[PDB]
Structures are given as C-alpha cells and as structure tokens.
Amino acid sequence: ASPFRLASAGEISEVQGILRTAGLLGPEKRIAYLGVLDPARGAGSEAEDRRFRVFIHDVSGARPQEVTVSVTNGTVISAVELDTAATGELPVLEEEFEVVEQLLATDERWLKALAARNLDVSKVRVAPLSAGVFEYAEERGRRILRGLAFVQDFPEDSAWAHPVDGLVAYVDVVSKEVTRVIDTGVFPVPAEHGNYTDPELTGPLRTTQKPISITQPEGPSFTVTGGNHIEWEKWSLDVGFDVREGVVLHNIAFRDGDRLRPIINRASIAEMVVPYGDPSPIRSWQNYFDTGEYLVGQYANSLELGCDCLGDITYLSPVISDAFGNPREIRNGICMHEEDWGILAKHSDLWSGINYTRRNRRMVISFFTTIGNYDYGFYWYLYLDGTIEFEAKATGVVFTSAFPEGGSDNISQLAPGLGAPFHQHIFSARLDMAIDGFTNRVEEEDVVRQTMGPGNERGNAFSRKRTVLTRESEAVREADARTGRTWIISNPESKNRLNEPVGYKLHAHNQPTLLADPGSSIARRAAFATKDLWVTRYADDERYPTGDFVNQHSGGAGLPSYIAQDRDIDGQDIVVWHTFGLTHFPRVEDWPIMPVDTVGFKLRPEGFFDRSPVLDVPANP
Amino acid sequence: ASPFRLASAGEISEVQGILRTAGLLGPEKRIAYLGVLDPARGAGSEAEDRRFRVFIHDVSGARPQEVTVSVTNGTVISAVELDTAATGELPVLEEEFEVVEQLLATDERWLKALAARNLDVSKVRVAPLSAGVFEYAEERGRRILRGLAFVQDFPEDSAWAHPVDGLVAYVDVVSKEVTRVIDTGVFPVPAEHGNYTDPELTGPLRTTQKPISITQPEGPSFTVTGGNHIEWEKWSLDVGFDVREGVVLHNIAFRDGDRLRPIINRASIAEMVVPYGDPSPIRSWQNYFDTGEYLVGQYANSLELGCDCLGDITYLSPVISDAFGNPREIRNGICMHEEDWGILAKHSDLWSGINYTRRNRRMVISFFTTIGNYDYGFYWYLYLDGTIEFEAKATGVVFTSAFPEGGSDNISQLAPGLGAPFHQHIFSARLDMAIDGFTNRVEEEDVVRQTMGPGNERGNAFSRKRTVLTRESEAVREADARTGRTWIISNPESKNRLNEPVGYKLHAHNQPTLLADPGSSIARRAAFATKDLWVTRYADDERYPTGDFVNQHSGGAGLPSYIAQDRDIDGQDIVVWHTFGLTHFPRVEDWPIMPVDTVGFKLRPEGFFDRSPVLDVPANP
Ligand SMILES: [Cu+2]
Ligand SMILES: [Cu+2]
Ligand code: NA
Numbered sequence A, B: 001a002s003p004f005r006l007a008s009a010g011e012i013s014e015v016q017g018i019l020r021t022a023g024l025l026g027p028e029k030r031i032a033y034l035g036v037l038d039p040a041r042g043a044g045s046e047a048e049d050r051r052f053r054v055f056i057h058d059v060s061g062a063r064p065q066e067v068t069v070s071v072t073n074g075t076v077i078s079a080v081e082l083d084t085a086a087t088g089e090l091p092v093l094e095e096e097f098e099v100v101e102q103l104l105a106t107d108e109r110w111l112k113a114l115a116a117r118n119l120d121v122s123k124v125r126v127a128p129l130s131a132g133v134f135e136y137a138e139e140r141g142r143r144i145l146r147g148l149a150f151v152q153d154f155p156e157d158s159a160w161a162h163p164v165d166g167l168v169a170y171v172d173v174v175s176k177e178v179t180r181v182i183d184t185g186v187f188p189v190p191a192e193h194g195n196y197t198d199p200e201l202t203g204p205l206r207t208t209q210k211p212i213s214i215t216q217p218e219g220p221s222f223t224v225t226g227g228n229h230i231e232w233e234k235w236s237l238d239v240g241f242d243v244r245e246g247v248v249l250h251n252i253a254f255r256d257g258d259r260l261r262p263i264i265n266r267a268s269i270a271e272m273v274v275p276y277g278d279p280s281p282i283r284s285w286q287n288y289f290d291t292g293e294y295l296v297g298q299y300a301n302s303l304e305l306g307c308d309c310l311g312d313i314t315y316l317s318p319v320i321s322d323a324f325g326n327p328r329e330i331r332n333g334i335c336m337h338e339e340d341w342g343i344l345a346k347h348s349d350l351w352s353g354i355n356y357t358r359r360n361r362r363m364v365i366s367f368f369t370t371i372g373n374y375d376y377g378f379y380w381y382l383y384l385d386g387t388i389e390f391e392a393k394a395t396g397v398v399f400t401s402a403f404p405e406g407g408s409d410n411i412s413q414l415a416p417g418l419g420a421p422f423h424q425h426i427f428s429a430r431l432d433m434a435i436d437g438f439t440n441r442v443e444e445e446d447v448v449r450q451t452m453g454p455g456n457e458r459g460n461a462f463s464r465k466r467t468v469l470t471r472e473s474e475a476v477r478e479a480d481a482r483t484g485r486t487w488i489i490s491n492p493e494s495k496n497r498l499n500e501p502v503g504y505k506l507h508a509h510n511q512p513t514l515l516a517d518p519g520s521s522i523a524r525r526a527a528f529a530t531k532d533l534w535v536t537r538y539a540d541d542e543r544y545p546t547g548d549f550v551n552q553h554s555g556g557a558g559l560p561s562y563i564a565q566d567r568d569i570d571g572q573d574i575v576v577w578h579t580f581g582l583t584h585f586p587r588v589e590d591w592p593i594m595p596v597d598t599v600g601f602k603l604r605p606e607g608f609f610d611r612s613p614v615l616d617v618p619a620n621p
C-alpha cells in the first residue's frame, strides 16, 4: 500500500480511538484540524507508517493541544499543551458558524444598534469573522471572533445585498462574552435584493444556448490505482487531500523513456489570504486567511456532474474528520479528467512539403471551495509537453458595505447605496522541488539589454543573465515584468545531452503583491505576501508560509522566521514559495454574483528534456 | 447587402478588369497587395460603395503604383506612382519564394562559399528574407532580398536542422544581380536531422491517447448571415479578412436588453514583427515583419476538421487576389465555433440555502498562418460575460544557426552544433474603439498604495487612480505590472445606472517590449514596439503602426509620425494600439518542432453594464 494514499474512514476512526484510549479526546474537546502527515525523507525504503496530526480545542476553557498519533501502531507520538497567546489560536471551528450571531442577539448594545436601524434581530445574519491582532489587549490569549451584520429579508434572500454598515462587534467565544460593540453611526441599509435566481432580476432565461457535448467513447486516458495514484501521458503523481490545504499533489514525475524522472515532490496552496483595503474601522481589521484560519479543504463542495465538471470525470471523495473524530466523506469533492487543449505543435513546410499538426491535452485535478461569500476553484493542470500550471478561479458574491454618499477612495459602488470594499486575494504555492531528484538550486533570470556599440554595431543584440540564489538570506525575490524575470529550478548534478543542467522555469503573472503598509499588522502576519518568491531549505516542520497557528497570531511567523536560518540552498533539498494574487476593485458586473476571474502560474521544462518530449504524439483520428 | 461582407471572387475579377480597362494591369505588373476598404465614417446611411486598394509592382523596373478602385462603379478612384526610396518598397511577392536561391545558384561567390563547405548547390535552400535598412547605400530605392542557406539532405528533409552559418548574400530582385556575398568563415553545418515524422526520432507512437469527442447535437448557438455576420449570446459582429492583417473583426457590439451597444468598431493585428538579438553580421539585420512585409492573411492555412478545429465548426473560405488579379479562395481558412469554458459563476450560500452554478462559453474566430519557419494561430474570443480576448499561439520550427563552440550570449543550443538565435515576436493590436458609440477617452489606472497614519491608522488602505490621456502627445504609455496598471476606455457621455461612465478595461500581460537599443534601425522602423500602449485620433489613412509600405522603409513611419499631430483624444473617435509580445530564448524542448507558446490581452467590461450581464444564463442540462 502507498504511504501517500488518501486517509480512509477507518484511519480517522482509529485516531479517534487512540485520542480516546489515551485520554485526549474528552467530551469537551473539539478537533479543529486533523490530517495525515507525509512520509519522512528517505523513510520510504518499504514500511507502513501512517501518522496523523491533530489540533484539539477545549470549550471548557482549558488549554488546547497539538497531538501526533501513529494509526499504524495505535500510539500517541507526542501531545503538547499550547499557550495560544504565544503560538496562536486554533483554526475557526465549523461549530462557530452561528455563535457570533447567537451571542450578539442577546446583547443589549447590539440590540440597541439594530433597534436604531429598525432591523428585526431574527433577520440579522452575522458570520464568524476572524479577528487578527490589533490594539485590544483583552484579546491576547483569548479565542475572539468579530461580527458584521447582513439583513436577510426572508430565509432565501441574499444577505450580502443588505450590509449594515457603521456597526461591528467582537466576541470572546469561550467565555461567551461580547467584549465590544462599536457603532460609528447610521448608514442606510441597501434596499435592492441580490437574488440571482429571482426571475424579476434575471429576466426570462436565455433559450439560445445549444448543448455542448464532451464524451470519451473509450473512456479516459488516465488510470487511477491505489485510490489516488494517477498515470497519464507519461505523468505519474499521487492526489492528496488535506482539510487545510485542499488538494495536494505528491510525487509529480514524468516517464522519459524508461526512466521515471521526478519533477516536484509536493505541490500545494499552502496559504491564501484576503486583505481588505477599506480604512473604515468597521472593516479595517479584516483579513481572511481562507486557508490558514478557515481550512479550505473542509468546505470543499460536492461537485455535480455535467454542471461543475463536464465530460468523462473520475471523482475522488476524500474523507476528513468532524469535530468529534468521526470520519465524513466529501462526496465527489475532487474532479479528475483530461481536456483537449487546442494545437500542440504545427508546421507547414514549403521546402519539405510536409504538413504537420498535433493536438494538445491536459490532465485536470480540481476542487471548489466556499468560504463565506467567496467560492474558489483550485485547478492543477499537467500538459503533454511537460508544462505544469495552477489556476485559481475566484467567484462567489463580493463582500459588501454601504457606499458612502460622497464617494470613496476605498470602496466601489454596486447598486444604490451598496458598496464593495477593495481587497486582494493572495495565494502562496509551496512547491517542494525535486527536479531529477532532490539536489536542486534556483536562479533568477532577467533579460539583458545591450548598448549599441562595439560588438553590437547595429544595436540589435539582447541577452539573458542567471543569478544563483545561494543562501536563504538571498532568496527573497520580487517580480520584474519589464525585464522578463523568471526563476529557474535546476539540478546542477543532472545534465541533458547538451551538457546543460536540467531545469524548469517558473513563469509568474507578475500581479501586484500585498499593498498594505509594510508596518501594518497584515504585512507582519502575511509577510509571505509582500514578495513574489521565497526559497527555503526543506524542513519537515516548515509547512505553511504563515506558520502552524495563523488565527490571532502576532506578526512574524512562518517564512520570515524560517529564512533567518540562512541555510545553503545551492544544490540542496529546497522549497519554492510563490506568492500570486488578484487585486479586486469590484465592478458593477460583479453584482449580484460575480463572474469568474483567474490568477495562477506555470512551470515549463527548460532543458529538462533532450528534445521535444511530444514527438511521439500521433496525429488525431 | 452589408458593406462589411467579405470580398467575393466576382469583386476581385472586376478589380482586375478595371485595372485592365484603365491600363494599370499590364502583362508586366504584379499585384503585391489587394484588399477591400472599410466604409468611411457615417457614409453608411444606406448605399453600396465597395472600394479596393491595390499595390502594383513592376518587374520591368518601372515605378510601382498605389491604386484605389470602385468595383461598385467600375472606376479608378486614384492611381499614384510610388517613389520607393521615399515611401518604402512593396510587400514581398509570393513569386519571390525561389528567386533568392535561383539567383545565388549561379553566382561565383556563392558557389565558392558552398564549395568550401562541400555543399551540393542542388540541396541548398534559401528564403526571400526581408532586408531592412542598414549601411548599404546601393539598396536605397532598390527592391532587395537577403538570403541564408539551409541544407536539405533529401527533398523531404527539414532544412532548418542544417543552417549554413558564416554566410549571407544580398540580391537586387529587379536587376537580378547579387549585390554582395559575405563569408565570415566556416562553421560546421549541424549534422543531426530534425525530421519529426521519422520513426527513428519520434520513437514508437503513443497508443495511450483515448479519443475526446466534442459534438453539438442540436448544432451551434451562433448564426451566420450575409456570409460573415455573426450573432451569438448577445454578441453581434462581422468577420472580415484582409491579405495583410488576416482575420479582422468589425462592429463588435452587445445586445443589452433591446439595445445594440457598440464596443469595438474594428479589431485587428495591424503588425507583427520578429526582431533577432544575435549580433553576428550573418543575422544582425534580420527583423521579419510577418504582417507588414510578408502579409499574414496570404499564407493562411487550410484548416483540417478534427485536426486544427475540433467540434462543430463553421468555416469561412476567404477570397484573395493572386499576383495577376485572379481570385483564389483559401478553403477552410477561418474557423468559427463555440467552446465550453468552465465555470462562469458559482456560489453556495449557507444563509439562503441556495446552491448556484453556471457554465461559461466562448465564441472563437480563428486562423493559422505560416511565414517561413513560423506558424502562428490568431484567436479572437468573445465570452458570455462580455470579455473580449485575443490570443496568439506561436509554433513552427525555430530559426536556426550554428552554435558557437565557446557558447554564446545571444544564441541557445538545440542539438550538437545547432543554435537558435534569441528573438522576440511582437504584435500590435489596433482597436478602433466604440464604447457605446464613438465618443471615447482612455484613462491609465494604477493601484495606489497608502501610508499608515491619520485616516489609515492600521495601514491597510489601498486605492486606485485614473489619469485621462487628453492629447496624443500624452498617450504613449508603458506597462507597470508592479502597480497593476491597466487602461480604461470609456464613454464620458454614456453613464450606467449608478451615474458612472461606461467602460472597458484592457488587461495586458506586461511582457517585455522591444529590447533593441533605442538608436537601432529596428527601434526606428518598429517604434510602436517600444511602448505598450498608444492612443491616436481616428484617421482613415492611419491603418498600420509601421505605415503602409514597411519593406526597406527608413525609420520613423507610422505611430511616431501620427501622434506628432497632437490631436484631442478626450471624448473623441479614438484608436488604441496595444503592443504585446513573446521574448524567446529557445529551449531544447523547442527542437525539432516547437510546442505552442502564447501571448495576448483581454478587455473586460468596467461599469459598462448595470449588473452582471449573465444572470439570464440557465442552469446546464
Ligand atoms: Cu474579490
Ligand atoms: Cu520564437
Ligand atoms: Na525539495
């Protein structure tokens, strides 16, 4: 059995039992995170060893714990009481969905604010919004959530159409106290509904769309073995799933001839954060770490055939733990399929008389998640020619506010009275590299302009330069689109037939990075997001660019602490962390539900192969 | 009948006759360019008036002519003798394909160079390479081609595998003289073949690709009327085709309710150039204006069903003129089809209980062309949500050279002895804008970072700024990826329901622009390529960013001369010219035939609509 197989229900049940048999999963405990650990380096000689890591919350007020269990052996490997003021609070619990609303609904300050605005408390929705760290000393070491009000006129109404601006509240979840209620003044609650299934708003539905049918009469070209091992068009990999990160790809490798050549050891989106750029005190604290605070895998959607994934789809249904250690399946949570991708290569040659055309295809591994108002699709693609790409598709309903009557430098107008504060959605892809094995290095490659003169008399020459990043202190890099900057991951000990080191080149989109002031709380807690590329030396405990416990953690955790080790990354086992995001000034067209927008990156082989790896693709039938 | 219909064979035949009946199409003339003119502004009240513009070469040595004919009336509208030293030489003629090779094959200098290298002249291929303008005074006012040698070992061999470096020749086409033969010394001719259909190089073909079948059982959702008018999912447009530009889109408009709203009056790729960055004198002159010198429409491929365009495809077969004024059809030269495009919009709402997913689709209008070694696919896409995108797909065989034995700062290695000089492929999209009509303006929009302090105490705020480009002298703009720079085209006299001007935002890829030294010949002749965005006031004679006659034209023509008029572009009939390109350092994986790489741009509505324009899309069946 593969040590990279997906967690089974049985494994989750055994963890529950171990935590029970060991006395750590009392009646008052809540599992905030549970996931299988990857195998340790080299340990994979040939021997079963499945360990799970668990974060356990306590609703009675006692200290939470981080616990690692071996399900193979039925033993607790380590169990540590956490001091949350020091190392952070645990991820937001699904059970806290309704708690902020419920606590506020009996608070006299909250009720006074709603009553001033003539709002029926039974119609006021409030989400568990993450708190971050600001000026409130009472919050240090307490599990805090904040709450903003949205009115639902009726149970199926879109509450996002009706934000209640000028009002915010904070809650101590464990003590069940409302610590603060802030009311900066009355803003009109936007009146129009945003019900995108109401015929009065949609108009008559189009009758003009004729079907598009995608079928595979002989079935798909990939195989799935051991539950999650994929083999497709020379690619080999394992599809993992973690409640925090979502779909993770392991052991990405390409069969070049009769050699299985590793490329990427693990690829994941290790963090994703949505910082808001509205300086109103009602929202200026808001930065939603969808991955690190909320856990994007936990909220993976069940994907409907013909609707979310079209064509011949093979599904995985990953198993996660609920708060009590009971396994539950996310039915049809991962889609896997191959797609036609246009022309692969084409040439019509006058001299030889040969006309040649080949088609491309990609293998797609995807999931969709929902975090509050946002819905995101995470797509990994593998192409015939060796290209690897990630794409995020951002949709959902935009987070709303009032639109101030004098306009705004930080909020856009969507409908009368209705605003959308500016924000970014910033991802971190953690790519544990293994180009032809683990001995890798990273070079930054810039185009080089040349001056007209001796050696270049016609002033046409241009060139390239590559700079090796040798130590972590040197490996925090920024984009330079104007100079075509890319980063090449190579194996200095593996050469192609031309005696050049094999490599892959990362092509970024060069979108803006984190816009916040560098002195801000968010710049400190999401320091990864301030730079496009970081390279670290692999360590098994360096998993997330924001650290292990993101919720209410002080600034400084994660990448900026890791790289202080200033380790050798020149021909070593290294990890690339690429920051990329969308900067969103919402448009009227984003309302009442937003069309998908995209951001991502790709890696293309760069002298990895000895010639095109797709000369054996046959002409299409 | 629509004045924007494609030229018919009959129209071409009538032009031939007029040029004949009028005495301008003697036996010794060669048509180098022929195309229908667009209708003049406002002239389209309701009245037939089809005019054709023709460039006529003379092989006897007399002066060439530019001629405009009315086929509606059977009259010559204007006919002007050209002084080519002043206004440029005429586009390269298809009949010159073999002339450089033929002239060189009897030249004693050329033969001496081949004999030194033991090359059989009958196996040496030479292309009509464009000359540009350099230090050779004898070339001013003469029609010159240059020639580089490639060996074909047998008639179906790929000559690109066997470049003969150290050797170049220039030819006066009309006088049939070889003006110069330059031999800088012997480089080994690369030995390996690049025959990507030879089983010894491809290996056994893959048997693993299972079919992907895309069908439309009720046919396509678009209609085609009047030969080239498309109606699809609220979009309305006319598909044109010109021998220089290729596919051109006219009258792009969107039916919002019961109003047909114009968006773009004409969209085309008005120039595309491939400058080379190798300072060797064997190649340092080479810059191929695939559009302006060679005419990309002329070489549009006939596209094979199931191979080049997959699914339910409607073809156009555009008619062009041969050198003698005879019409000829490019059978199946344009593909039109709709494609599924993933998720359009999706949200799962906990409060309302509503789960909503919709799928996107795009209308595709495409052609593929071949210019020597290059093959490019030009794709225009229209999406349901109002997005317009262009994508170029670059493939073919890379232009080769020797690989110098000491390595190179300007050439990459592909195979033993075989190099590929560095180059760029740079496009200019000419977008004659008509956002809600012709009264338009352009703003440059940058993200605005804000300092932590009063009004922004938590240091989270960020904003945007828009700067109106008011006159042409101000409208030559560069990218700023780091600040998320985009350009918005709006109609200041047309407001959406929120009282904001309707607009579309151009999102560029922010790839490097022209790398050559600013003092270079190519920087002067392709000045457009040195900046990402230009805005001009519409003029019917301002068609190409490089001017009308690109071949051997001195520096200075086109956009930099046009914008010297410093015209008002603030709420006027304007044209956006966007430069975008690929910078290519060829990889081993590009050899012996290159996988497709892409570049392009898109425009998305920005307060053009009063809310999402896709709320009436129904759930998929
Ligand atoms: Cu957003
Ligand atoms: Cu190229
Ligand atoms: Na590694």
Ligand code: NA
Residues within 6 Å of the ligand: B265, B432, B433, B434, B438, B538, B572, B573, B574, B575
């Ligand atoms: Na215009």
